[PDB]
Design a protein around this motif. Structure first.
Motif, PDB file in Angstrom:
ATOM      1  N   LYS A   7       0.810  -1.213   0.000  1.00  0.00           N
ATOM      2  CA  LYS A   7       0.000   0.000   0.000  1.00  0.00           C
ATOM      3  C   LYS A   7       0.846   1.267   0.000  1.00  0.00           C
ATOM      4  O   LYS A   7       0.319   2.348  -0.281  1.00  0.00           O
ATOM      5  CB  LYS A   7      -0.949   0.001   1.200  1.00  0.00           C
ATOM      6  CG  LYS A   7      -2.252   0.749   0.952  1.00  0.00           C
ATOM      7  CD  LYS A   7      -3.103   0.833   2.209  1.00  0.00           C
ATOM      8  CE  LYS A   7      -4.343   1.686   1.980  1.00  0.00           C
ATOM      9  NZ  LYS A   7      -5.290   1.620   3.129  1.00  0.00           N
ATOM     10  N   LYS A  10       0.634   2.754  -3.498  1.00  0.00           N
ATOM     11  CA  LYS A  10      -0.611   3.369  -3.935  1.00  0.00           C
ATOM     12  C   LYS A  10      -0.779   4.804  -3.446  1.00  0.00           C
ATOM     13  O   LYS A  10      -1.727   5.476  -3.863  1.00  0.00           O
ATOM     14  CB  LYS A  10      -1.798   2.512  -3.485  1.00  0.00           C
ATOM     15  CG  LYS A  10      -1.647   1.053  -3.888  1.00  0.00           C
ATOM     16  CD  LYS A  10      -2.981   0.352  -4.068  1.00  0.00           C
ATOM     17  CE  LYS A  10      -3.811   0.403  -2.804  1.00  0.00           C
ATOM     18  NZ  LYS A  10      -5.109  -0.292  -2.989  1.00  0.00           N
ATOM     19  N   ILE A  11       0.113   5.289  -2.582  1.00  0.00           N
ATOM     20  CA  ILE A  11       0.086   6.681  -2.142  1.00  0.00           C
ATOM     21  C   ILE A  11       1.132   7.537  -2.836  1.00  0.00           C
ATOM     22  O   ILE A  11       1.121   8.765  -2.648  1.00  0.00           O
ATOM     23  CB  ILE A  11       0.252   6.793  -0.613  1.00  0.00           C
ATOM     24  CG1 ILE A  11       1.467   5.988  -0.154  1.00  0.00           C
ATOM     25  CG2 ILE A  11      -1.001   6.310   0.093  1.00  0.00           C
ATOM     26  CD1 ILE A  11       1.802   6.163   1.309  1.00  0.00           C
ATOM     27  N   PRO A  13       1.255   8.326  -6.091  1.00  0.00           N
ATOM     28  CA  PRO A  13       0.573   9.357  -6.897  1.00  0.00           C
ATOM     29  C   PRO A  13       0.104  10.563  -6.102  1.00  0.00           C
ATOM     30  O   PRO A  13       0.134  11.684  -6.626  1.00  0.00           O
ATOM     31  CB  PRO A  13      -0.619   8.601  -7.496  1.00  0.00           C
ATOM     32  CG  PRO A  13      -0.149   7.236  -7.631  1.00  0.00           C
ATOM     33  CD  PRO A  13       0.774   6.980  -6.472  1.00  0.00           C
ATOM     34  N   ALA A  14      -0.315  10.376  -4.855  1.00  0.00           N
ATOM     35  CA  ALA A  14      -0.729  11.482  -4.007  1.00  0.00           C
ATOM     36  C   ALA A  14       0.325  11.863  -2.979  1.00  0.00           C
ATOM     37  O   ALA A  14      -0.006  12.507  -1.978  1.00  0.00           O
ATOM     38  CB  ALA A  14      -2.046  11.145  -3.311  1.00  0.00           C
ATOM     39  N   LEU A  15       1.580  11.480  -3.194  1.00  0.00           N
ATOM     40  CA  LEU A  15       2.670  11.815  -2.285  1.00  0.00           C
ATOM     41  C   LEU A  15       3.299  13.130  -2.726  1.00  0.00           C
ATOM     42  O   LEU A  15       3.326  13.439  -3.922  1.00  0.00           O
ATOM     43  CB  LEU A  15       3.706  10.688  -2.243  1.00  0.00           C
ATOM     44  CG  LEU A  15       4.708  10.638  -1.088  1.00  0.00           C
ATOM     45  CD1 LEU A  15       5.016   9.199  -0.737  1.00  0.00           C
ATOM     46  CD2 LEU A  15       5.996  11.333  -1.464  1.00  0.00           C
ATOM     47  N   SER A  16       3.778  13.910  -1.756  1.00  0.00           N
ATOM     48  CA  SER A  16       4.241  15.265  -2.042  1.00  0.00           C
ATOM     49  C   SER A  16       5.534  15.264  -2.848  1.00  0.00           C
ATOM     50  O   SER A  16       5.656  15.988  -3.841  1.00  0.00           O
ATOM     51  CB  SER A  16       4.431  16.034  -0.736  1.00  0.00           C
ATOM     52  OG  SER A  16       5.727  15.809  -0.208  1.00  0.00           O
ATOM     53  N   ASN A  45      -5.427   8.115 -11.113  1.00  0.00           N
ATOM     54  CA  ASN A  45      -5.824   9.203 -10.234  1.00  0.00           C
ATOM     55  C   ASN A  45      -4.900  10.408 -10.325  1.00  0.00           C
ATOM     56  O   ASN A  45      -5.080  11.368  -9.570  1.00  0.00           O
ATOM     57  CB  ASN A  45      -5.890   8.707  -8.786  1.00  0.00           C
ATOM     58  CG  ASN A  45      -4.614   8.011  -8.343  1.00  0.00           C
ATOM     59  OD1 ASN A  45      -3.642   7.926  -9.092  1.00  0.00           O
ATOM     60  ND2 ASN A  45      -4.615   7.506  -7.117  1.00  0.00           N
TER      61      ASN A  45
ATOM     62  N   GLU C  33      -1.963  18.489  -0.769  1.00  0.00           N
ATOM     63  CA  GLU C  33      -2.695  18.409  -2.027  1.00  0.00           C
ATOM     64  C   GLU C  33      -4.158  18.061  -1.800  1.00  0.00           C
ATOM     65  O   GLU C  33      -5.025  18.510  -2.559  1.00  0.00           O
ATOM     66  CB  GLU C  33      -2.046  17.380  -2.956  1.00  0.00           C
ATOM     67  CG  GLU C  33      -0.597  17.680  -3.321  1.00  0.00           C
ATOM     68  CD  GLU C  33      -0.051  16.739  -4.382  1.00  0.00           C
ATOM     69  OE1 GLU C  33       1.056  16.999  -4.899  1.00  0.00           O
ATOM     70  OE2 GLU C  33      -0.731  15.742  -4.704  1.00  0.00           O
ATOM     71  N   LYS C  51      -8.377  10.323  -2.088  1.00  0.00           N
ATOM     72  CA  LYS C  51      -7.244  10.718  -2.914  1.00  0.00           C
ATOM     73  C   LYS C  51      -5.925  10.141  -2.416  1.00  0.00           C
ATOM     74  O   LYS C  51      -5.219   9.469  -3.174  1.00  0.00           O
ATOM     75  CB  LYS C  51      -7.155  12.247  -2.988  1.00  0.00           C
ATOM     76  CG  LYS C  51      -8.264  12.870  -3.798  1.00  0.00           C
ATOM     77  CD  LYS C  51      -8.208  12.359  -5.220  1.00  0.00           C
ATOM     78  CE  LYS C  51      -7.069  12.995  -5.996  1.00  0.00           C
ATOM     79  NZ  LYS C  51      -7.063  12.560  -7.419  1.00  0.00           N
TER      80      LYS C  51
END
Lengths: 232, 50, 57, 121, 213
Positions: A7, A10-11, A13-16, A45, C33, C51
């Motif tokens: 997992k 899967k973060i 793409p939304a990681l800084s 996403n 974000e 998200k």
RNA sequence: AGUGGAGCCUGCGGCUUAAUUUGACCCGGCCCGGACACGGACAGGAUUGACAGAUUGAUAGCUCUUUCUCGAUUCCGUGGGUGGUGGUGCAUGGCCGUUGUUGGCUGGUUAAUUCCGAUGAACG
RNA sequence: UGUCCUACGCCGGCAGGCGCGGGUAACCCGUUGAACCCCAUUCGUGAUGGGGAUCGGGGAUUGCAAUUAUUCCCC
């Protein structure tokens, strides 16, 4: 090889900070199945301009060396390019045009990714932008395949784009270099598909192009399509 | 799949015991070569042919 | 045993649940974000982010 | 019934760590080495099938490929469909199969089953 | 990108920053940052001032070094206690070298010498490496030789891993000894020969080599 | 000295089996798969990604439920209307390999200029 | 022969465990304490103390996994 991914992937793409994460992960050291796994989540996403950055740095280098090594594209990498084409805006400006501007693209690279264009659906406004952008710059032995297969899409061609293609053809008026046979089917498909959208001055423009640059076999068929073309 | 005087043929039959009923009669190709039904392979009518 | 495809449940007017009349009925994500527009799930035992997969219990 | 001088009912009360000495040397090593996720999930499915079944007949059949999982004493009375590579064999777990595996009750092979000249002139 | 530049600390700091205000060398900078070395334990800010502290004082402020040697010594003997309680290395390695730098140019002095010397047995290799190099430059560049040999002998008698660092200390420090301490060292190097351990034996064999070479 | 006879093991045939892979094979369960036109749905919403449990032979949002989130990146059908990522040989242009001489350190790591990380010229 | 060969101590009857060392090797294993062989004891022509297959029960080790016995040991 298979199974569920952790997992922590899967973060991303939304990681800084993707850059430090991706570089420490060693993307060149990944497996072939990892490309299909990573491209799926990085095109699902993730935003458009963000995903274009991922294609240039990771997907485009990994698709170039594999076809340069085995002279064949792996099945997993094929579905990765299929999943990248799910976002057409990032794929054109991240995979297609940077390969077009590289100058070292060959027939095998053109004929492999060209089948991907035929096998899938691309929006017309996205596809028409690729028409105009590739028509401006110079002509090699591989970008013609990008033309003819995109002409085979049979989309509603904008009329400003039709000027850009014929300007590219009018650019090839005085050159004495031999035109390949594949250039003729690119011309043949153009006069096969858009014969009704060409103007009367554009009608004679391709005719003198046939006069100065003929073919011993294919030119009468190009002559046949022009002479049997209805005006707008 | 083809080997040196050894082949497996598919889509000729769909059941294992079909080829047992049609074993003792010979086989031929379009290009002149002949063959004999050696043994069934199983459950989908596949056979190995010599 | 045919492979049936998932069909997304068409929830009628799913937009019209995060507010009344003014303020936000649901939580907002504390990430950078995700947040100021990114609503959180309110499950019966957890809170989930659509998200960045943020999970609060 | 008695197994190693221990009846069935307190054997069901008996936990794993004192089941070590009642099994043989092979099963004692296997239990120390642990049970993977594949057989933990199956044991729940036999437990679920025994839960919802009517209390006066045998439960429903559970089909599995786990031929290498030993039979714990709580598995008795279950309906396991064990696979030999071709079909699923339905075996009813009697209390006499405790130390044995599951693969040896679904045999993967079939038994084998195997006119002189006299001159006239 | 900013270390390899000429304007970086690689080259030009070693040349023109020594002219503090245009005249080399003024120690008024180090006599201005006490509020950073006191009541401030911010990491990598005490480290960067430790770089310039080692780098600048090489360019002979020797009359300046003589008068305010006590000012420097009290400014660092408390540093020797401060992050020894905290346990860092980056702030620690250069401040021990600049201590060797100030000791090289030069009753209270031997206490600073013992402060430099007592960090040789330190477990962290960087702190030990500078102290190992620092002691060599101070003695070769002597009244401090007698006390430091007395430290060397007692440390061997106290103890396996630390003895390797001490024989490395004794490797290039035997030549700057007087007769009686060589005679005592010749016993002490010969005592560990009775132990059959091989790495201590080879270093002690090579230590006698640097004596005679 | 044996082998040939006995017991066991090993190889060719042969016999049974679904296969007993050959001078990798057998059962099952997944993955993926045109465009064109026309008729539908599509911001009321087309569609993407997901926590938990389960079917499954297992897990798996590649499946069966509870709805969380992305949004045009769209998804349902009908046409005898188009559709090589083929393998293989010949002529064909560029390119490697193939038939001397002299010079010239932020950082963490270790007994140790130890380990890892950034980082040139002429003469015959 | 090798960075997998092993020395030594303790425990168990055996397979086998725990600890601590040597050796990149005419440096440790290793004065390579090998087997037939040699000297004493029991057996006495008997499918026998020859021969060991095939089996029953248990224990230990490597492995994701030992069922159709991985391998080893005892009766």
């Amino acid at each position: 090889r298979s199974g569920k991914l952790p997992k922590a992937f899967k973060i991303i793409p939304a990681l800084s900070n993707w850059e430090q994460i991706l570089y420490v992960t060693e993307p060149e050291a990944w497996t072939a199945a990892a490309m299909y796994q990573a491209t799926r989540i990085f095109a699902s996403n993730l935003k458009e301009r963000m995903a274009q950055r991922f294609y240039n740095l990771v997907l485009l280098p990994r698709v170039r060396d594999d076809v340069a090594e085995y002279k064949r594209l792996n099945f997993h990498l094929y579905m990765a390019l299929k999943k990248a084409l799910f976002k057409p805006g990032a794929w054109f400006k991240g995979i297609l045009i940077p390969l077009c501007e590289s100058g070292t693209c060959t027939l095998r690279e053109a004929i492999i990714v060209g089948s991907i264009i035929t096998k899938c659906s691309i929006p017309v406004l996205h596809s028409s932008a690729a028409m105009l952008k590739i028509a401006e710059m110079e002509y090699s032995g591989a970008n013609s395949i990008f033309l003819r297969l995109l002409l085979d899409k049979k989309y509603a061609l904008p009329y400003r784009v039709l000027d850009a293609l014929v300007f590219h053809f009018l650019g090839f008026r005085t050159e004495k270099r031999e035109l390949p046979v594949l250039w003729h089917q690119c011309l043949l498909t153009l006069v096969q598909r858009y014969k009704a959208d060409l103007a009367t001055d554009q009608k004679e423009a391709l005719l003198e192009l046939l006069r100065l640059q003929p073919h011993p076999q294919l030119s009468p068929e190009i002559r046949r399509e022009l002479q049997s073309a209805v005006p707008r | 799949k083809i080997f040196t005087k050894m082949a497996v043929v598919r889509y000729m039959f769909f059941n294992r015991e079909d080829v047992l009923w049609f074993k003792p009669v010979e086989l031929r190709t379009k290009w002149g070569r002949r063959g004999h039904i050696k043994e069934p392979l199983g459950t989908h009518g596949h056979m190995k042919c010599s | 045993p045919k492979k049936n495809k998932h069909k997304r449940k068409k929830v009628k007017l799913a937009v019209l649940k995060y507010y009344k009349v003014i303020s936000r009925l649901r939580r907002e994500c504390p990430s950078d974000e995700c947040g100021a527009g990114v609503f959180m799930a309110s499950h019966f035992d957890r809170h989930y982010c659509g998200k960045c997969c943020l999970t609060y219990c | 019934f008695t197994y190693r001088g221990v009846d069935l009912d307190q054997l069901l009360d008996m936990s794993y760590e004192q089941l070590m000495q009642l099994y043989s040397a092979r099963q004692r090593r296997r239990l120390n080495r642990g049970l993977r996720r594949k057989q933990h999930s199956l044991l729940k499915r036999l437990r679920k099938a025994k839960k919802e079944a009517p209390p006066m007949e045998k439960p429903e059949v559970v089909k599995t490929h786990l031929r290498d999982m030993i039979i714990l004493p709580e598995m008795v009375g279950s309906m396991v469909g064990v696979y030999n590579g071709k079909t699923f064999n339905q075996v009813e777990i009697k209390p006499e199969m405790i130390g044995h595996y599951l693969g040896e009750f679904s045999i993967t092979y079939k038994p084998v089953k195997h006119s002189r000249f006299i001159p006239l002139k | 990108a900013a270390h390899k530049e000429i304007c970086a600390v690689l080259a030009a700091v070693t040349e023109v920053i020594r002219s503090q205000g245009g005249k080399e060398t003024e120690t008024e900078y180090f006599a201005a940052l006490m509020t950073t070395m006191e009541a401030v334990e911010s990491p990598e800010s005490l480290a960067a001032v430790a770089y310039l502290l080692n780098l600048v004082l090489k360019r002979v402020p020797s009359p300046v070094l003589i008068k305010k040697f006590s000012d420097t010594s009290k400014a660092f003997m408390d540093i020797m206690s401060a992050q020894a309680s905290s346990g860092s290395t980056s702030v620690l390695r250069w401040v021990l070298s600049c201590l060797a730098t100030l000791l090289r140019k030069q009753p209270v002095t031997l206490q600073v010498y013992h402060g430099l010397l007592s960090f040789t047995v330190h477990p962290k290799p960087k702190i030990r490496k500078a102290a190992q190099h620092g002691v060599c430059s101070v003695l070769k560049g002597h009244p401090a030789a007698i006390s430091t040999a007395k430290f060397c002998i007692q440390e061997i008698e106290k103890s396996a891993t630390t003895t390797l660092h001490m024989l490395t200390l004794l490797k290039d420090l035997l030549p700057c000894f007087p007769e009686g301490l060589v005679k005592s060292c010749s016993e002490t190097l010969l005592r560990v020969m009775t132990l059959s351990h091989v790495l201590v034996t080879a270093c002690a064999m090579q230590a006698f080599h640097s004596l005679f070479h």
